[PDB]
């Protein structure tokens, strides 16, 4: 599995593969991703940071943009409080093994130059196209909703990044960047993790997440409570966790009573067992809780 | 006719009269109005500048905001070219007798503070309300269309103005300001002059205007060509010109053949004559062309 394939692994989409291969051919390459500072860092974040780690291993300089301005505007606290959360986020990301440079949105997003270009971009972007780009991320829709995608695009341009990484929900905004900017950004899109209740995406504000520093008993309790319908793989958070975070061979342990220990050599194997209902939701949960704990331990320990 | 009535004269609307009376009671009061720099200054501008003149005569300090940034963003030339048009506009306004302070949009509209508040306002303004505010001013609608009204409002706030003056087309934007800002701006709205072709409003870009420095023969030709249907007063640019710019008693001159000279002591009088078709569109045009020339002469001479 070469550098390209290591980057591609577990992504939903790369726009475009041909363009990424060209990026790979150069010494100096950067990749960026934006996060709003968050009191809790969960599996949703972890999945994306693993992807950034794949990229640095391929020779990319990594830049994390912390959206402190977005938080501040949205009544979530003063800049200093938010910088404190942002700085905690840096520690977590480091604990995960990522070696990155960090930039806060407020450091450049109010620069005269940047703003002027937000207004330039807004004369070139239709409202319809702007709103369309926001459907996957967006009551009483505010004008801020159509400013947001333009700022994202403008940031891509201001920082001169080669590759932009984000979840699948960011894809139309990235498409917008590739049609509005002089230089086409290569886009790498990660799957959107389902929350533990199987309802929406995993979110810090929806209380449906596993945080990377949750205690073992908290992880076990949260897994036990998860949505995990037998034979159903679509929208199954426990299966997603198995696909994106666990290492194979995986051992699922069961009493002899019920078929004994089961050893699976790939997620695809694990998938067929579950579809046929040869693997019971309870034994899967058990195995996932325990493996997840061992995976997260060194992160939580460093914290 | 007292200071209030002199301000009210020939306005479409004052929001609100009670609030304007309170403004009048103070020593230090300011009134502002925004114009985009224009190669031609026409009767549309003149009407509004007459209103600013009424206000300074009432003790108001006048501020004219020149929208050089709006022009620049909209591909109309470099800032220096536009500042040159803006500076010409100042001379014209002075020639009309207005004694004002001038500020260009680019001097403050990209300030970190101002921009931050544009984004604050955008989180508080719905897209629907923003678009509604722009109907009277707005193919392929751009995101810039919903940013524009918020900037107008933000400018009202940044400059701390007491009274905002504009044409009736600005009214929903002004309403928006009065609901979004801590301090309610008194709003004075002037009628929107019909262009000479009777088609739209008078506009520099629609070639349907009389410029204040047009030559006498140009004025005569433009008046002669105007839309001026007998007995029709609504949407009649020649009648509007008579209402807003001419002095009474007005003498309309006609041969004895056709009823002789006619002397009217008010526009209302002039109106009834025209409705009953007692006054013929040609004699009205003739009288309006000639009076308009004498009115504009001292302005054109100073230029």
UniProtKB/Swiss-Prot annotation, chains A, B:
Q: Where does ATP bind?
A: 204
Q: Does the keyword Iron apply?
A: no
Q: What is the effect of changing residue 107 to T?
A: Confers specificity for the non-natural amino acid O-methyl-tyrosine
Pfam families recorded: tRNA-synt_1b
Region spans: Tyrosine: 148-155
Binding locations of L-tyrosine: 32, 36, 170
Tell me where it resides.
Cytoplasm
Q: Which domain of life is it from?
A: Archaea
Q: Which UniProt keywords apply?
A: Aminoacyl-tRNA synthetase, ATP-binding, Cytoplasm, Ligase, Nucleotide-binding, Protein biosynthesis
State the reactions this protein catalyses: tRNA(Tyr) + L-tyrosine + ATP = L-tyrosyl-tRNA(Tyr) + AMP + diphosphate + H(+)
| A GO CC term attached to the entry | cytoplasm
- CDD domains noted in UniProt: TyrRS_core
Main subcellular location: cytoplasm
Which top EC class is named for this enzyme in its record? ligase
Q: Which family does it belong to?
A: Belongs to the class-I aminoacyl-tRNA synthetase family. TyrS type 3 subfamily.
NCBIfam families xref list = PRK08560.1, tyrS
- Assembly and binders: Homodimer.
Q: What is this protein called?
A: Tyrosine--tRNA ligase
**What species is given as this protein's source?**
Methanocaldococcus jannaschii (strain ATCC 43067 / DSM 2661 / JAL-1 / JCM 10045 / NBRC 100440)
Gene that encodes it: tyrS
């Amino acid at each position: 599995m070469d550098e390209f394939e290591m980057i591609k692994r577990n992504t939903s989409e790369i726009i475009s593969e041909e363009e990424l291969r060209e990026v790979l051919k150069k010494d100096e390459k950067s990749a960026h991703i934006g996060f709003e500072p968050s009191g809790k860092i969960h599996l949703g974040h972890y999945l994306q940071i693993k992807k950034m780690i794949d990229l640095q291993n391929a020779g990319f300089d990594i830049i994390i943009l912390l959206a402190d301005l977005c938080a501040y505007l949205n009544n979530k606290g003063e800049l200093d409080e938010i910088r404190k959360i942002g700085d905690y986020n840096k520690k977590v990301f480091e604990a995960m093994g990522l070696k990155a440079k960090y930039v806060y949105g407020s450091e450049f997003q109010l620069d005269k130059d940047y703003t002027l270009n937000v207004y330039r971009l807004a004369l070139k972007t239709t409202l319809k196209r702007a709103r369309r780009s926001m459907e996957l991320i967006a009551e009483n829709p505010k004008v801020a909703e159509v400013i947001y995608p333009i700022m994202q695009v403008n940031s891509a341009h201001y920082r001169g990044v080669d590759v932009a990484v984000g979840g699948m929900e960011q894809r139309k905004i990235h498409m917008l960047a590739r049609e509005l900017l002089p230089k086409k950004v290569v886009c790498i899109h990660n799957p959107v993790l389902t929350g533990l209740d199987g309802e929406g995406k995993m979110s810090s504000s929806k209380g449906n997440f596993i945080a990377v520093d949750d205690s073992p008993e908290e992880i076990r309790a949260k897994i036990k409570k998860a949505y995990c319908p037998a034979g159903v793989v679509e929208g199954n958070p426990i299966m997603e966790i198995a696909k994106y975070f666990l290492e194979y061979p995986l051992t699922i342990k069961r009493p002899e009573k019920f078929g004994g220990d089961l050893t699976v050599n790939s997620y695809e194997e694990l998938e067929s067992l579950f579809k046929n209902k040869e693997l019971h939701p309870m034994d899967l949960k058990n195995a996932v809780a325990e493996e997840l704990i061992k995976i997260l331990e060194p992160i939580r320990k460093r914290l």
